[PDB]
Each structure stands twice: as structure tokens, then as C-alpha cells.
Amino acid sequence: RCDVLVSADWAESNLHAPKVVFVEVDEDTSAYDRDHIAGAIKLDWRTDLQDPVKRDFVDAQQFSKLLSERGIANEDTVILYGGNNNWFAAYAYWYFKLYGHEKVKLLDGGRKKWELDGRPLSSDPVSRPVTSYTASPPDNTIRAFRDEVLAAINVKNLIDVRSPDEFSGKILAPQRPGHIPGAINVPWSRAANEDGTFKSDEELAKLYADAGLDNSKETIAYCRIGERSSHTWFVLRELLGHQNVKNYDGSWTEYGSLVGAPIELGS
């Protein structure tokens, strides 16, 4: 598990280790601007990682430019962590894998566990000398687009990670309500302990088996905009080792607005 996940003790021991860089990823940088893990830098999920105009996230060259400017190199081990339940740090992890970054890990429990453990935080500014990062083209075996999602109904597992009432169609969002036909509902938070850390392999395999994950089928996870489904994608692909898992980043805001798209109601 050390290949994709590191503990808070490991992280605290390796703050200033050679070729290791901590990256805080949240909705805003406002939490990071307050305080952060010593020497960590920041990526703004909204203004750094999304296209400013199109509904997408940055492409290869924009991702390369961003990392180059933040002083991240190809051969760095990247350690991702965040508040809001590590949701955005898992999303960035997914972006890092998409663009072919090999050494990257989630900090287990993210900011929540760091602060529960009472670990030190730095109020100091951080600058890293700019590097030359070069991303690989996207590995779309880990991403799903609308057309393949439509084609995956009754072919692949579809893990809806929204609230039980969004799934059944009782509530639209916080466009059409309901869920993708044949989807199973596993709210993202079932995969997580109170301290923010991921549950064990035993706990997770049972969670998804009970819910009806079919091991004869490949898998797609979805949310509203793919944020909490990143976190589920991480559990399924990186923790449990399922070899064929995609994040449908379009998710319900796209799917629920598609004309003519099949929708199913009820739990």
C-alpha cells in the first residue's frame, strides 16, 4: 500500500527528504494560506486545475506549465493532502495519474488526520525554483466520457458515490434527478474512517461486494462533478487493485442534463 498511500508518521519523518514534495489541494488556497505542512506548496483546484472557459480540466501542456511554475519535476515523489475530506487531493492524484506521473501518493487521512494527530503546521510562505515538467498525453483508460458511459449501462459496474437521496431521485442536487440505470450507490464516505484515513482492504472489499460490485465487470465511478468519485476511484483502482476503473468526471451534472439519457429512480 506504500506505493500509493503514506501515513502521517512517514510524512512527518520525510518533510525534507530528497526529491519529495508535499502539495496541498483544496477548493481554495485559503486554508493553505492560513497554515500548511512545512515546505508544502499549493494548487488551487478551481483556478489551477480547471480550464478557465471550457468545461474541462487543464490539458497536457497546461498541466506541464503549471507544475513547471510550481517547481515540481517528473522524477519527484509527490505527496498530496487536503482538507474537505481529502476529496480534492484525490482528484489531483487522479490528474497526476492521468498525465503519467509515476511517483505520487495520498497522505492517509489528509489534513483532518494531521490536525487530529496535532502535527505541526507552518504559516511561512513557500517558493520552489521553477522546473521543466513534461506531462505524458492522457491515459484515458482511467477516465470515462459521456458516450462510453451510455454504452456501459448493463455492461460495467457504475458506482454512484452521491447521497442515498440523490441516488434514488428524492433530491436533484444540493437537469433530471435519479441515477444511471444499473448503478449501485456507495456514498464516498463509507470508505473512510472517522480520522479521515482509508478503511482496510478487508473492510473495503466487503463494502463493495455487499453493495453489488460485479467482479466479472470493469468499473466506472461517478459523483456530480467527479470530486468524491476520484476518492472512490482511488479506493477501487489503487487500494483494491481493480485493473479497469474509470472516473466519469462529467458525472451527474453532465449526465443528468443530457437529452434522451436513460435514468432510473429508487434505491
UniProtKB/Swiss-Prot annotation:
One Pfam match, given by its short name, reads Rhodanese
Q: Which residues form the active site?
A: C223
Q: Which terms does the record give in the GO molecular function aspect?
A: thiosulfate-cyanide sulfurtransferase activity
Q: What is its EC number?
A: 2.8.1.1
Output the PROSITE patterns linked to this UniProt entry: RHODANESE_2 (PS00683), RHODANESE_3 (PS50206)
Q: Which SUPFAM superfamilies match?
A: Rhodanese/Cell cycle control phosphatase (SSF52821)
Output the superkingdom of the source species.
Bacteria
Q: Write out the residues that bind substrate.
A: R228
What is catalysed by this protein? thiosulfate + hydrogen cyanide = thiocyanate + sulfite + 2 H(+)
Which parts of the sequence belong to the Rhodanese domain? 16-123, 152-264
Q: What class of enzyme is it?
A: transferase
Q: Enumerate the UniProt keywords alphabetically.
A: Repeat, Transferase
Read off the InterPro entries from this record.
Rhodanese-like_dom, Rhodanese-like_dom_sf, Thiosulfate_sulfurtransferase, Thiosulphate_STrfase_CS
What residue ranges carry the coiled-coil annotation? Answer: none
- Domain remarks: Contains two rhodanese domains with different primary structures but with near identical secondary structure conformations suggesting a common evolutionary origin. Only the C-terminal rhodanese domain contains the catalytic cysteine residue.
> What does this protein do, in the record's words?
May be a sulfotransferase involved in the formation of thiosulfate.
PANTHER family, alphabetized: THIOSULFATE SULFURTRANSFERASE
What name does the UniProt record give this protein? Putative thiosulfate sulfurtransferase
Native source species: Mycobacterium tuberculosis (strain CDC 1551 / Oshkosh)
